Amino acid sequence: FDRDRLFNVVARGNPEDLAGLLEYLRRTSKYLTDSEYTEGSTGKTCLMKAVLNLQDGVNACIQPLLEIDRDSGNPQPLVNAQCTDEYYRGHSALHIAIEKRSLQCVKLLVENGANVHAKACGHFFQKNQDTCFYFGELPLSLAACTKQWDVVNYLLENPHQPASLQAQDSLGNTVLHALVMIADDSAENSALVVRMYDGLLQAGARLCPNVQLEGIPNLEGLTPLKLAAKEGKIEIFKHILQREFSAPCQSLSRKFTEWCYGPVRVSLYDLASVDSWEENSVLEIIAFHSRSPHRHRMVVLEPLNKLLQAKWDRLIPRFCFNFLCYLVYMLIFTAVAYHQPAGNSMLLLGHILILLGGVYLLLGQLWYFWYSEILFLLQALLTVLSQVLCFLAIEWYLPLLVSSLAMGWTNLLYYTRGFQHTGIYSVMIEKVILRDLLRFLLVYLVFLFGFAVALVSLSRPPYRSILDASLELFKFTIGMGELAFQEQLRFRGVVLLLLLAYVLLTYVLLLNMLIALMSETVNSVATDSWSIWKLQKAISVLEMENGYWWCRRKKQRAGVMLTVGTRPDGSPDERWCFRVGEMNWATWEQTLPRTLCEEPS
Amino acid sequence: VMIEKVILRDLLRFLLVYLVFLFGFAVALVSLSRPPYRSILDASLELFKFTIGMGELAFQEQLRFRGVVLLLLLAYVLLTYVLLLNMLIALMSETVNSVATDSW
Amino acid sequence: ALVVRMYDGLLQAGARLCPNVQLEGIPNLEGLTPLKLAAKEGKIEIFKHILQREFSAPCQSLSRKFTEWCYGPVRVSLYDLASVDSWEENSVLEIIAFHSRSPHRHRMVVLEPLNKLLQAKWDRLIPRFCF
Amino acid sequence: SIWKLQKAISVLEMENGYWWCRRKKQRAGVMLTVGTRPDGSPDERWCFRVGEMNWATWEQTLPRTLCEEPS
Ligand SMILES: C=C(C)[C@]12C[C@@H](C)[C@@]34O[C@](Cc5ccccc5)(O[C@@H]1[C@@H]3C=C(COC(=O)Cc1ccc(O)c(OC)c1)C[C@]1(O)C(=O)C(C)=C[C@@H]41)O2
């Protein structure tokens, strides 16, 4: 009974042609799992091609083939056979039947004993590659990622071998982690993800009520909310963070109403993994651990904005204290640099005080690293280097001393971010330097030094060196340039023509730079620089909460310890919540919410 | 009306950041040149002449530290061009995103 | 809407009536087939339509776009590179670059099979550009 | 798109070779068998592969495929 005849029979779909197969299999002691019947290049079995070729609903050759497998005594059944390639490893026929959207074949395969925890862990099924599909590794994850709620409901609630929601793949991801990983912030994708997420949570409340599905961490240590915060998936992070359920599963909410009087109400938000009191929070991950381009859009969301504004309003005296200490330090730097040359003792005290302040700032910035932090690092490094060369009397200390003086007075613009009006202005300064200035300066220096070499070789004292002709040409861009008809020179008209062409080309280049900045500024969302400034302020408030480098600071927890309801296991659940008041003048059309308190307080 | 709105909004924060830039380079040039730059109050005037268009940059043969003075002047010219360009781009941001009936 | 519907109907009727002959292979007196005349003239809508074309089961051999496999949401599509690839003489790419006097040639470069084929050809030749 | 056309003209001139030494050029794509002709033969065509992701696939009808499983 040949292999190709077996594949042609199971692809055709007639069960009667599979006659005499079991009697042939009995005498030769060969099994359908054996390597003569697999492809060998991939390990593909005849049941897999029976499921790949289906009828209108379901092929009719599967169950007689599985009966023939049961008839002979096979220690390894055919329904649990996996692929063996490096590309497509661990894939089984239950995955194929779930992929083909076919519920009757899934019922049939589980009904004959298929493993519902087989992991499709080959290379095609891995995370970040070219032309792959990462859904998790499990059949329940494949059913949830492809919008098949009937297959999900069967795999959870079948009589024999139920699938576990707590089960997790090689990366430690459950089904909720995998639903975070497939989000792309499109409309249809988000509508799939939030609906399947809530359905899985409610089914876990029904099936396994004692376990918390969202507390389970991955192998990196992340829960679904922190993975959503790290990955930068805004649609599901916003949805999870303000979540309201109904009466039988109301303990799975993260948003509550404390009281409601007319149009005013007070809402409560759960601060479980959000508040920066605890280790490895959502705020620290948005600020410090996410490499997404849109972190500043995630700061602006609804519970986070008011929590950060409250944390900022407490820490304004510490911000003003740090500003005054840095400004006193720079006044001492200036008085020590201006008097370099009763007095010598004051100068010695000034030099030692500048060395201690430089070592202080350098240790603080290195403790940070273990745009603006780079500049504070460079100032501190050059200050310590200048004072170490001042101790040895190397006499080349004075350029480094005055260079670090200029950088310290410029680094004073870090503190402009305390106000909105100056903070957005300095955000724009950084964006003008790091984007628009450098390619201007590239094309300009290529234009400058070509004309410089041309004028030196043509004038051979107007232009003696390359380095002096480039200075005389730069004076044109300032406004101090000297163009005259040179009577002394042999080649007078050509020098005059080269100067006139230089002036025209640099006017064209400056005009292009200005027009490119208008192209960037007219085509822009106005909220974006505001939100970049908000993220600057959030990073500042988290570093001020962490404390200084020598003295760690004991930090208070935010919120209020408030009793929300009862757990399914007969206890009250007290949660730390953040209060946000609201006004709504269209309340009276909508239905009234359930409240914790009868009257305001 | 536009003259008042340009003075009371756009000019003062430009002038804040500009004076912080001006006097840092002034102190640096006086302490490095120790007669090109004798006092703080005269070096700040010589640096303000660059913003007008009358600034004098030359390779100072007399000074001990010649290349560093030249590099500090070139960096000053670049930073003030960046600041003026930012002021202009912020006024275009305020003027393109506005209702025309409001000044009326 | 007239041109693409009448074009497909004429192709299917040629499949029914004279199946051995290829209607789109016949050249003009300049040496251009319909796709190259569309590329030269700068007619974007019909050039885009011809370049990614899918028919149904009785005339499926007249397509220029195919599906190799499909698994859930991911799929791999196939595009015919008959007169497009610059390996052969007088291609669509050489005509858009060198023989068309249309003002909007740069809009025809951005279309869906052409953009990725040009990005692949650029990614191979970066060492020669740096050399 | 004007920059893209500049890049396309550059890549075609670099494929043509230098002026003294013409360059033997490779054909792009993959020689893949698509179906059968009306005159009882298979038609092999050179094709270019482009991958796609679509999260609204399940409302639409399924396409006809060349391969049963990915590769
Ligand atoms: C890291 C970069 C890109 C940088 C390092 C130094 C060399 C710098 O020259 C530049 C570019 C440059 C290159 C050559 C000639 C002139 C300018 O700009 C900054 C850099 C640009 C200036 C302007 O400073 C700012 O950007 C404003 C600012 C400072 C500190 C902040 O913490 C800050 O946060 C908002 C903003 C400061 C200098 O350190 C300075 O005062 C001196 C003497 C030169 C400046 O290079």
Residue numbers in the entry:
A (entry chain A): 73 to 413, 427 to 455, 469 to 558, 586 to 726
B (entry chain D): 525 to 558, 586 to 655
C (entry chain B): 263 to 393
D (entry chain B): 656 to 726
What's the paper's own text on this?
TRPV1-TRPV4 are non-selective cation channels which play important physiological roles in sensing noxious heat, maintaining cardiac structure and maintaining skin, hair and bone physiology. A distinctive feature of TRPV1 and TRPV2 is their permeability to large organic cations, such as the cationic dye YO-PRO-1 and the sodium channel blocker QX-314. The non-conducting structures of TRPV1 and TRPV2 possess two restrictions, one at the selectivity filter (SF) and second one at the intracellular mouth of the pore (termed the common gate). Our data shows that binding of RTx induces C2 symmetric conformations in TRPV2, but the extent of C2 symmetry depends on the environment in which the channel is reconstituted.
Classification of the TRPV2RTx-APOL sample revealed the presence of four classes: one low-resolution (~7 Å) class, which was excluded from further analysis, and three higher resolution classes which are representative of three different conformations. These include one C4 symmetric and two distinct C2 symmetric classes refined to 2.9 Å, 3.3 Å and 4.2 Å, respectively. Unexpectedly, the transmembrane domains (TM) of the three structures obtained from amphipol-reconstituted TRPV2, TRPV2RTx-APOL 1-3, show similarity to our previously solved cryo-EM structure of TRPV2 in its apo form (TRPV2APO) and adopt non-conducting conformations. While fully bound to RTx, the TM domains of TRPV2RTx-APOL 1 and TRPV2RTx-APOL 2 structures largely retain C4 symmetry. In order to determine the effect of RTx on the TRPV2RTx-APOL sample, we aligned TRPV2RTx-APOL 1 with TRPV2APO. The transmembrane helices S1-S6 of the two channels aligned remarkably well (Cα R.M.S.D = 0.86). However, RTx binding induces a 5° clockwise rotation of the ARD when viewed from the extracellular space and a ~ 10 Å lateral widening of the cytoplasmic assembly. In addition, RTx causes a conformational change in the S4-S5 linker, as well as a displacement of the TRP domain. The conformational change in the S4-S5 linker is caused by the introduction of a π-helical turn at the junction of the S4-S5 linker and the S5 helix in the TRPV2RTx-APOL 1 structure (S4-S5π-hinge), which is absent in TRPV2APO. Nevertheless, the RTx-induced conformational changes in the S4-S5 linker are not efficiently propagated to the TM in the TRPV2RTx-APOL structures, and they fail to open either of the two restrictions in the pore.
